[PDB]
Coordinates of C-alpha atoms in Angstrom, one line a residue:
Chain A
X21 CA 74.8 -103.1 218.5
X22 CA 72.6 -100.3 216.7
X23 CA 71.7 -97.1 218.6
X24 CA 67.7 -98.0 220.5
X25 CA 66.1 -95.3 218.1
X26 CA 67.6 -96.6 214.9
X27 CA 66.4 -100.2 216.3
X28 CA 63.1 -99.0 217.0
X29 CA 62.6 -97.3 213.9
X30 CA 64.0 -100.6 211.8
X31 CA 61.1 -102.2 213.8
X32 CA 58.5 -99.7 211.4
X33 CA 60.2 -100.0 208.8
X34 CA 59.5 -103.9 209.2
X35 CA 55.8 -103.4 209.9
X36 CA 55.0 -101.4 206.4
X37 CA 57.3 -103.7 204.8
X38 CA 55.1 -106.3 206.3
X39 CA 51.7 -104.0 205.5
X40 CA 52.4 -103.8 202.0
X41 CA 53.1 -107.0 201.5
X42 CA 50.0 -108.2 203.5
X43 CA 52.4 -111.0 205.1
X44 CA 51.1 -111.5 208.2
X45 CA 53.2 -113.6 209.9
X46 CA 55.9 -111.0 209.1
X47 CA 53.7 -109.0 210.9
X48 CA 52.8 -111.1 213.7
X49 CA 56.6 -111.5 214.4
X50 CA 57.1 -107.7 215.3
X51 CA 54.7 -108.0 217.9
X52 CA 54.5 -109.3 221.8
X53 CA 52.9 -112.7 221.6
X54 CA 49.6 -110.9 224.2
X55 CA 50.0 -107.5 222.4
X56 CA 46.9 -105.6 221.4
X57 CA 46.5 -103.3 218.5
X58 CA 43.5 -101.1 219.3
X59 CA 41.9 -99.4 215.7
X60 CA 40.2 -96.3 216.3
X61 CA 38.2 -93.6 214.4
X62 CA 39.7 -90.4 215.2
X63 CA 37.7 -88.1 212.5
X64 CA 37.0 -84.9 214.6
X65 CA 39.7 -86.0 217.1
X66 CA 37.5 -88.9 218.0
X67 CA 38.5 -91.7 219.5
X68 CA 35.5 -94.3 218.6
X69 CA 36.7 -98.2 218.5
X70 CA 37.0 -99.6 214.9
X71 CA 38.7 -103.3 216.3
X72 CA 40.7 -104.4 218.8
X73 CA 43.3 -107.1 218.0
X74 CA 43.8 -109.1 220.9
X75 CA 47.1 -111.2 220.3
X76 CA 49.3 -112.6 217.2
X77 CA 47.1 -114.5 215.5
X78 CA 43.9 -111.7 215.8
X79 CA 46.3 -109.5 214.2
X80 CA 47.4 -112.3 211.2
X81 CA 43.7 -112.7 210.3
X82 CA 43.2 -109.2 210.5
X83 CA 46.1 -108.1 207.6
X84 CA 43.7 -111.0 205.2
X85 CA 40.5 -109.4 206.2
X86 CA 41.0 -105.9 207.1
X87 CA 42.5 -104.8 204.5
X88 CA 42.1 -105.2 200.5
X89 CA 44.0 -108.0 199.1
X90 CA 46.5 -107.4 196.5
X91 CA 44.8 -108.6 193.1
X92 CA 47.2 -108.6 190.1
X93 CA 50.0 -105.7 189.3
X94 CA 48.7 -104.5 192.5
X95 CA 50.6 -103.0 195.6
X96 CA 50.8 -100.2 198.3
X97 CA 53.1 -98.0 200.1
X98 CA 52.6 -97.3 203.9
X99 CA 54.2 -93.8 204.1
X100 CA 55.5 -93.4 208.1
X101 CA 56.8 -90.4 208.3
X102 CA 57.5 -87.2 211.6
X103 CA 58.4 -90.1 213.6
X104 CA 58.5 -88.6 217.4
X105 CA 60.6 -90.9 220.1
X106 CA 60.2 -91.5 223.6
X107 CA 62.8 -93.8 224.8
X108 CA 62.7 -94.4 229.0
X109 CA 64.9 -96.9 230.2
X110 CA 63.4 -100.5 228.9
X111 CA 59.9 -99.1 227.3
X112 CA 59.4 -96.7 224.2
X113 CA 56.7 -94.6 222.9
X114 CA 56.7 -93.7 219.3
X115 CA 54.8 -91.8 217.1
X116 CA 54.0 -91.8 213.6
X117 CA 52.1 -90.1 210.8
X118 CA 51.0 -92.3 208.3
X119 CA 49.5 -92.3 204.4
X120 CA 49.2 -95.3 202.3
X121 CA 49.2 -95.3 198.6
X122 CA 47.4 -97.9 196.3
X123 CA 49.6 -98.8 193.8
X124 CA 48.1 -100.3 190.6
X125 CA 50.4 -101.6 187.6
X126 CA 49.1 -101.1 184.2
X127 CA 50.1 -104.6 182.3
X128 CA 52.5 -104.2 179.7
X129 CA 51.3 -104.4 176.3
X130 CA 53.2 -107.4 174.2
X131 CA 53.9 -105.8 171.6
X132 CA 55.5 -103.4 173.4
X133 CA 54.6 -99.6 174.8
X134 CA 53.6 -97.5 172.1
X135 CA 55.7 -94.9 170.6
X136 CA 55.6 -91.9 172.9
X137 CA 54.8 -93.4 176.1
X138 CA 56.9 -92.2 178.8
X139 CA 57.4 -92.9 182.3
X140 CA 55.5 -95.1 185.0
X141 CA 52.3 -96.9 183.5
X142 CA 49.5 -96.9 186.1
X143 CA 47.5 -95.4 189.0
X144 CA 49.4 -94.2 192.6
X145 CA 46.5 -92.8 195.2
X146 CA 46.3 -92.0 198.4
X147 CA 43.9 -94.3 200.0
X148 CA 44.4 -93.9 204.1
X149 CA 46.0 -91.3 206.3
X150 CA 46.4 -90.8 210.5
X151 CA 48.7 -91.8 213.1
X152 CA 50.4 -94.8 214.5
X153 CA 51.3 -94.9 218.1
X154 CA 53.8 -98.0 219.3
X155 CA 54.5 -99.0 222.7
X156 CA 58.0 -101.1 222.5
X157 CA 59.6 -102.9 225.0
X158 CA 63.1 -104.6 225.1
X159 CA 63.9 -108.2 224.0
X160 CA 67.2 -109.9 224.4
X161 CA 68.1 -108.8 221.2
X162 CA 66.3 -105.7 220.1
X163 CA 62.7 -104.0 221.0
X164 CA 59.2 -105.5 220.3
X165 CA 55.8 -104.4 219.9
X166 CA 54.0 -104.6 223.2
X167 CA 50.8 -102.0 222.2
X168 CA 49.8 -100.3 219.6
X169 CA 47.3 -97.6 218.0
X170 CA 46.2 -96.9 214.8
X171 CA 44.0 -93.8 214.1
X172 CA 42.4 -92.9 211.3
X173 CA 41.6 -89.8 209.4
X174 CA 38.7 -90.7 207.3
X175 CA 35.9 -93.3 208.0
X176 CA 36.6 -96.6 207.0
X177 CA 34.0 -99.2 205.5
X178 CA 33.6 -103.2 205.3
X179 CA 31.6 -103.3 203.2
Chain B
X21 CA 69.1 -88.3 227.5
X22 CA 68.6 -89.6 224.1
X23 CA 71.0 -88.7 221.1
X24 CA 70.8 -85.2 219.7
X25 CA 69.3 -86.4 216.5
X26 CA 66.1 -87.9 217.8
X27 CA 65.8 -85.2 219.9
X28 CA 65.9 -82.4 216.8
X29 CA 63.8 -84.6 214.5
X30 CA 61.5 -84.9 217.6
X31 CA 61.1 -81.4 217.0
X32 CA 60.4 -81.6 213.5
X33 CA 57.9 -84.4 214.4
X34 CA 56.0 -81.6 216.7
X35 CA 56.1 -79.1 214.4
X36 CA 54.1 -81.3 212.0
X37 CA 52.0 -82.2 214.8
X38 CA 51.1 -78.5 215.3
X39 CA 50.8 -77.1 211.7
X40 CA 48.4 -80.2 211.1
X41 CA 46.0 -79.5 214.4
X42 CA 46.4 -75.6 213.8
X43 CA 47.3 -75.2 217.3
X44 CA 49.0 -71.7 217.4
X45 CA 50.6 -72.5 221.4
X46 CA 52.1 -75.8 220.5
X47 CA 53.7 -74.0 217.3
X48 CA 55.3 -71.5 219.3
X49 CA 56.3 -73.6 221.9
X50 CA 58.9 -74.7 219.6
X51 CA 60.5 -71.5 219.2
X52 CA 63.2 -69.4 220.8
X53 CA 61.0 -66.0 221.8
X54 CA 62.7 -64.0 219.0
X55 CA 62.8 -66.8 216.8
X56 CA 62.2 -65.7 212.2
X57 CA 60.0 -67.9 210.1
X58 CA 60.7 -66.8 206.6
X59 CA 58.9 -68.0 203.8
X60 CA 60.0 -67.5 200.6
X61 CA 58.9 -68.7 197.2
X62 CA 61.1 -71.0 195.6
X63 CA 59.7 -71.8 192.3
X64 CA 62.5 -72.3 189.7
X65 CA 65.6 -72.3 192.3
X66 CA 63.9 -68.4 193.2
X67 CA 63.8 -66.6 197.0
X68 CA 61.2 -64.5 196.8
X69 CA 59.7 -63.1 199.9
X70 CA 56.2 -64.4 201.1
X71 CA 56.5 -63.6 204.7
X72 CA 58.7 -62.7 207.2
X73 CA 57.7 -63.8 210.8
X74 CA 59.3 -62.1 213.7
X75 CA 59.0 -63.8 217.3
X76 CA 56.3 -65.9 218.5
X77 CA 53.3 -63.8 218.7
X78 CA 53.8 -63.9 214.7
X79 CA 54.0 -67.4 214.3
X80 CA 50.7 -67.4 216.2
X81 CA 49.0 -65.2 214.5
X82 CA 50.4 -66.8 210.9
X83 CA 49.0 -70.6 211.9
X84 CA 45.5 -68.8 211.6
X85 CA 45.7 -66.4 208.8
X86 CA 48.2 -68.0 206.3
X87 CA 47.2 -71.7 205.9
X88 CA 43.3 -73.1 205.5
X89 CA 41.2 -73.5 208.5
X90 CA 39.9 -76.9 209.1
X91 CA 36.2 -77.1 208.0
X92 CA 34.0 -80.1 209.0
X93 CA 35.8 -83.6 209.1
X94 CA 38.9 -82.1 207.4
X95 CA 42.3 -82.4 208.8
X96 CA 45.5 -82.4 206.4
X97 CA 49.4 -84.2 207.1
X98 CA 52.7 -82.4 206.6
X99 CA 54.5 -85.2 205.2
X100 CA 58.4 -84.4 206.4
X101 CA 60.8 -86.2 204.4
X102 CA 64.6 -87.1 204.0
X103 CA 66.3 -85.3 206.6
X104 CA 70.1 -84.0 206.5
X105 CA 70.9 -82.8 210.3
X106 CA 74.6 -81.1 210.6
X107 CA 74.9 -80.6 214.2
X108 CA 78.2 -78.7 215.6
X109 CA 78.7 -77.8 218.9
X110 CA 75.2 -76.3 220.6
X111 CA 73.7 -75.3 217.5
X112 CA 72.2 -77.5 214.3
X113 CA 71.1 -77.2 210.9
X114 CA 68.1 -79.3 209.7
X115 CA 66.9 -79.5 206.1
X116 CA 63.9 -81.7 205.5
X117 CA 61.9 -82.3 202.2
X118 CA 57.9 -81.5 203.0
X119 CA 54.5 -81.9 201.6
X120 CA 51.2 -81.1 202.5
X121 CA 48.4 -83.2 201.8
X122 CA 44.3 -82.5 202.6
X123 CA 42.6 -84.6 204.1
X124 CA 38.5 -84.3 203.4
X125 CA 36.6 -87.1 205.6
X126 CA 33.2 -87.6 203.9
X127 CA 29.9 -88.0 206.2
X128 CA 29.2 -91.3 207.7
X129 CA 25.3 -91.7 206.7
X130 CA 23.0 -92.3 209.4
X131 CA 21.7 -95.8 207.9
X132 CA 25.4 -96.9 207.6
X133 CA 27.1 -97.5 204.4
X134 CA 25.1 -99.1 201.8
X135 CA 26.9 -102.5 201.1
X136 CA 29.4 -102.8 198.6
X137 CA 30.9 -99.7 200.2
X138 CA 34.5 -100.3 201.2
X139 CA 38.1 -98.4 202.3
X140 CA 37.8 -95.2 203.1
X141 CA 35.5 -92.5 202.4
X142 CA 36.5 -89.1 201.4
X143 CA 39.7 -87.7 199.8
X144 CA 42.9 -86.9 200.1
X145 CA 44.8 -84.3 197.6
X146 CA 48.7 -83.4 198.0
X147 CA 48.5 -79.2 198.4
X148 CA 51.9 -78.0 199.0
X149 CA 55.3 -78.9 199.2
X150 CA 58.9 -77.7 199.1
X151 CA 61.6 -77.7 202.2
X152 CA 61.9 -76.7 205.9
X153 CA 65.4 -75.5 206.8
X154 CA 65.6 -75.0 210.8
X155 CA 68.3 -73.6 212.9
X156 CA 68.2 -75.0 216.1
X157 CA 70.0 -74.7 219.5
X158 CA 70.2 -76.0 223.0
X159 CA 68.4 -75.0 225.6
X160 CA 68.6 -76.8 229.1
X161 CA 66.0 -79.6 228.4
X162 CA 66.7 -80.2 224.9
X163 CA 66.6 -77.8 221.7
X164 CA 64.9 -74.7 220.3
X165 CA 64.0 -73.3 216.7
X166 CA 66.2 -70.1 216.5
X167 CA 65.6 -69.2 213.2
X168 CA 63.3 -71.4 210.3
X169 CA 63.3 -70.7 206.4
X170 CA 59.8 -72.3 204.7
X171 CA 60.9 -73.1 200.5
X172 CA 57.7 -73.4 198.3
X173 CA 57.6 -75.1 195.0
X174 CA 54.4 -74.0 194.0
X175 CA 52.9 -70.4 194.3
X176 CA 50.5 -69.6 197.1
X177 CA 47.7 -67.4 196.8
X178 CA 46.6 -65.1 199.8
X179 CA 43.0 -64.5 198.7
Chain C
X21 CA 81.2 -86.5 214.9
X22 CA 77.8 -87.4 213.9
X23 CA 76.2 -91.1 214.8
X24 CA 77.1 -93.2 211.7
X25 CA 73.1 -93.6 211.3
X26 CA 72.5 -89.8 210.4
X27 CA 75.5 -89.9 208.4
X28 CA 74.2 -92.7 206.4
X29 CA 70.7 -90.8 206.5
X30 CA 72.4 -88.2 205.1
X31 CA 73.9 -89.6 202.6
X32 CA 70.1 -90.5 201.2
X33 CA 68.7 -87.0 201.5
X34 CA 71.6 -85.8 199.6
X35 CA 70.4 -88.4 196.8
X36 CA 66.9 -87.5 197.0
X37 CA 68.1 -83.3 196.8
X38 CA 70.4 -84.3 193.6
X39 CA 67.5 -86.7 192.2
X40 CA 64.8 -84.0 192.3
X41 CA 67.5 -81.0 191.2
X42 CA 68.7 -83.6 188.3
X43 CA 72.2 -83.0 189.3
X44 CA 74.4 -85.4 187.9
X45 CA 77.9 -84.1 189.5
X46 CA 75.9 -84.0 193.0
X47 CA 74.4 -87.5 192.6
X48 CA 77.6 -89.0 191.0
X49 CA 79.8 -87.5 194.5
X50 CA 77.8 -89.5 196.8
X51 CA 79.0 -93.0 195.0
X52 CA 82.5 -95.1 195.2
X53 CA 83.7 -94.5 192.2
X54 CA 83.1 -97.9 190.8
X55 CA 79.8 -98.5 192.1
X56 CA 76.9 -99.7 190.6
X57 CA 73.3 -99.1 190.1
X58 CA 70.8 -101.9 189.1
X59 CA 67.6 -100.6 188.2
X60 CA 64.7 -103.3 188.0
X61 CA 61.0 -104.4 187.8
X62 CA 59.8 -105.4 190.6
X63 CA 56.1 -105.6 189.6
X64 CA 54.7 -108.6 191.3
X65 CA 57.8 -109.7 193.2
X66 CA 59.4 -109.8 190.0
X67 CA 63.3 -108.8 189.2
X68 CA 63.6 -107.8 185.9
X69 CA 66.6 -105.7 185.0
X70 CA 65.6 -102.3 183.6
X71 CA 69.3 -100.8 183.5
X72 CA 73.0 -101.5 185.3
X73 CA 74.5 -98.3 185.6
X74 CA 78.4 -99.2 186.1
X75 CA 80.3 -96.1 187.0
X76 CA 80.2 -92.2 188.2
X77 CA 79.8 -91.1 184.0
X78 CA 77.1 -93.7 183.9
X79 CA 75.0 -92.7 186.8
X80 CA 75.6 -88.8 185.5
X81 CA 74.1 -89.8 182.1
X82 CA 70.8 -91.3 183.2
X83 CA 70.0 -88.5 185.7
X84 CA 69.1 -86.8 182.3
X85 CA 68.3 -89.6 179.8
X86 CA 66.3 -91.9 182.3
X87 CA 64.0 -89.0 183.8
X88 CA 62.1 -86.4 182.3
X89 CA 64.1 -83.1 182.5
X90 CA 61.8 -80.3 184.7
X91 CA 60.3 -78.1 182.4
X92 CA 59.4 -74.7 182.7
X93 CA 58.5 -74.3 186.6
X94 CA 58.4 -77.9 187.1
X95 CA 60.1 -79.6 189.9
X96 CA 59.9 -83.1 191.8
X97 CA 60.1 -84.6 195.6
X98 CA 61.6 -87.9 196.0
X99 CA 59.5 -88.8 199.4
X100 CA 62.2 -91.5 200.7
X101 CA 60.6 -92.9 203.9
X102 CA 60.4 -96.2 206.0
X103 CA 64.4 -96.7 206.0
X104 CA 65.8 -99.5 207.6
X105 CA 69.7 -99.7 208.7
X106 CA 72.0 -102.6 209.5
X107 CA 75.8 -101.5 210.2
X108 CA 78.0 -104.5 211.0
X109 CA 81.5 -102.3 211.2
X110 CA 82.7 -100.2 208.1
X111 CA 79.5 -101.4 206.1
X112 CA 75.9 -100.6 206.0
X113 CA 72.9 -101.8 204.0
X114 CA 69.7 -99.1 204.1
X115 CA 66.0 -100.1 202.9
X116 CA 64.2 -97.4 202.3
X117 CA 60.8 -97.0 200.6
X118 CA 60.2 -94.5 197.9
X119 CA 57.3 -91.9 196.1
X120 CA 58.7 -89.6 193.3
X121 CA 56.1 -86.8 192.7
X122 CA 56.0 -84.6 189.8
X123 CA 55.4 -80.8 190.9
X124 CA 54.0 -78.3 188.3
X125 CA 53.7 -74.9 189.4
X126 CA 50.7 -72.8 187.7
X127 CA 52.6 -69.3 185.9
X128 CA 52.1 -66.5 188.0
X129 CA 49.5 -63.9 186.1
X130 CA 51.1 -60.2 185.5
X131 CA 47.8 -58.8 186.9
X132 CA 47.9 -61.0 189.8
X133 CA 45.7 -63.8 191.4
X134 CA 42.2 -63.2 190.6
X135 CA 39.9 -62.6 193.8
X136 CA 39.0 -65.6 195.8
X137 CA 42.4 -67.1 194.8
X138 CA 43.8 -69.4 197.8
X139 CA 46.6 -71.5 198.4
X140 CA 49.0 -73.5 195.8
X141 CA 48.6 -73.3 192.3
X142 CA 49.8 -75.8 190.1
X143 CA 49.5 -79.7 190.0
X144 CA 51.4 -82.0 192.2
X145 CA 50.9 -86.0 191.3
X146 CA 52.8 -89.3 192.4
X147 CA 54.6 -90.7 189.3
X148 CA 56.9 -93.4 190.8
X149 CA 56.8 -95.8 194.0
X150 CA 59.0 -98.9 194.5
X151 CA 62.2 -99.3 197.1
X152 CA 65.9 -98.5 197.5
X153 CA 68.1 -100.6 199.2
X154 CA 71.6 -99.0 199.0
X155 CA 75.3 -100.5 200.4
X156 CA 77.4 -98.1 202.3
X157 CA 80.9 -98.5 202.8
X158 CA 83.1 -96.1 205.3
X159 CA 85.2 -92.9 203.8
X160 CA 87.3 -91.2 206.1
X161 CA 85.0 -88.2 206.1
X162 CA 82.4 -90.0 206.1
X163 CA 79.7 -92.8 204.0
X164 CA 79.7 -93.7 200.5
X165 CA 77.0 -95.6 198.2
X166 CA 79.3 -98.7 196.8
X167 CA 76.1 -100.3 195.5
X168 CA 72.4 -99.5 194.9
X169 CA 69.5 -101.2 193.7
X170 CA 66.4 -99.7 192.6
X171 CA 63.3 -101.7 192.6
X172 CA 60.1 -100.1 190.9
X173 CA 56.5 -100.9 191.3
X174 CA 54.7 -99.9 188.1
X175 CA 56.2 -100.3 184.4
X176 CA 58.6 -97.8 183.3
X177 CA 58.4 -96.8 179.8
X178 CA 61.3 -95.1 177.6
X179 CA 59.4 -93.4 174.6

């Protein structure tokens, strides 16, 4: 047994591991089976509806088509970070900033990198940024997701 | 009563939350009344005075006058980073790793985004970044800033 | 007595200080003597071997030779983030994600910042992303590293 903090914070650890890897039953698994991610617009300190997950599999079809795929050498980094942690008795609140990176892989020349190249070979930007805010509630063997809310920083589009 | 830790780095997370809203009150807030904020430039393993801030009203003033304002749709995350917390007794030492990124949301157009348009709109630039070093101690509810040290690894212009 | 997490935690912010100061006697001290450090592609999923680094006089000799030396008023942040801990008694694995940027500060001008001059001056880019999963074993003092894998998510070229 793991301290409720450390436990809680493994549990968004597991959700950007998830993110990034755009596996979304990984995700689905952190959550409540009725838990509702709500996706808001919070430019200006708004707080304007962007999609409301209703439920596991809402949120598995939403990590497919909410976010870019991962075409080839591709990747991303979900940057948590400031984490703040409300823990009262069976239910926690915590708070996270967030920034995700696209990570794109240049492909490796076969004949080899030329003389004088150094270093990484490719593109890291940052491509989102805002907060995350998790209600978690206890399970018989750790915490789960029963709520959460996502708010971003810039406007997002869908083409 | 949660673990010391999460309370400090709770702390932290607040600070982060008030440098990035540039909200002066919930700055100070963190702060013993007599509390130093000295910010030194760091560049090449230097300690060069930038500012000394003495006692709240300081701070305050400092959270206007000595970072950006937010224009129009702009915001910006402090992105605090692998912590070290020594804590002995009623008093602690926190070092974090920190960087400062801008956030510039662009205008959502009034006839919606033309299609093909996707992710999100407007930019986001890393704009500082060095280390926080906080001194903290216990007060009744939890624990106070006595004393902060601000490392920057770029210089900063005042104008 | 700290909670073994923040001791472990600590352990990884000492890493990233001694990464970004390119201090191979500081890295070197946070290892078991005999410990390892596997360095690999992890492009795509991948697990290609980029270096095993067997040994304390190994690790200190690719802090130089396997990372660009900081040039003149150059420095770097190792943005660890995301960590994940398991301790099942005297040993502990820890996930964490990872973004190295590269920070160049701008020279200072002898007749001073021209007028109109605000805020950082220099360059500050992400040049590395990827994960760290280390294994800790108990010290009596304390955590060690008694294994470390690095994955990295973009090519890594060597000249």
């Amino acid at each position: 047994t793991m301290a409720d903090e450390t436990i809680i914070l493994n549990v968004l650890g597991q959700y950007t591991r998830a993110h990034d890897r755009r596996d979304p039953d990984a995700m689905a698994a952190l959550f409540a089976p009725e838990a509702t991610i709500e996706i808001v617009d919070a430019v200006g300190g708004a707080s304007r509806s962007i999609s409301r997950l209703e439920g596991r599999d809402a949120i598995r079809v939403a990590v497919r088509q909410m976010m870019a795929p991962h075409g080839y050498r591709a990747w991303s980094q979900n940057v948590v970070n400031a984490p703040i942690i409300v823990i009262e008795g069976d239910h926690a609140v915590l708070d996270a900033q967030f920034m995700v990176f696209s990570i794109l892989a240049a492909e490796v020349p076969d004949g080899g990198w030329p003389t004088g190249t150094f270093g990484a070979q490719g593109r890291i930007v940052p491509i989102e940024a805002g907060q995350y805010r998790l209600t978690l509630r206890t399970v018989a063997d750790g915490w789960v997701i029963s709520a959460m809310r996502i708010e971003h920083r810039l406007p997002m589009a869908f083409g």
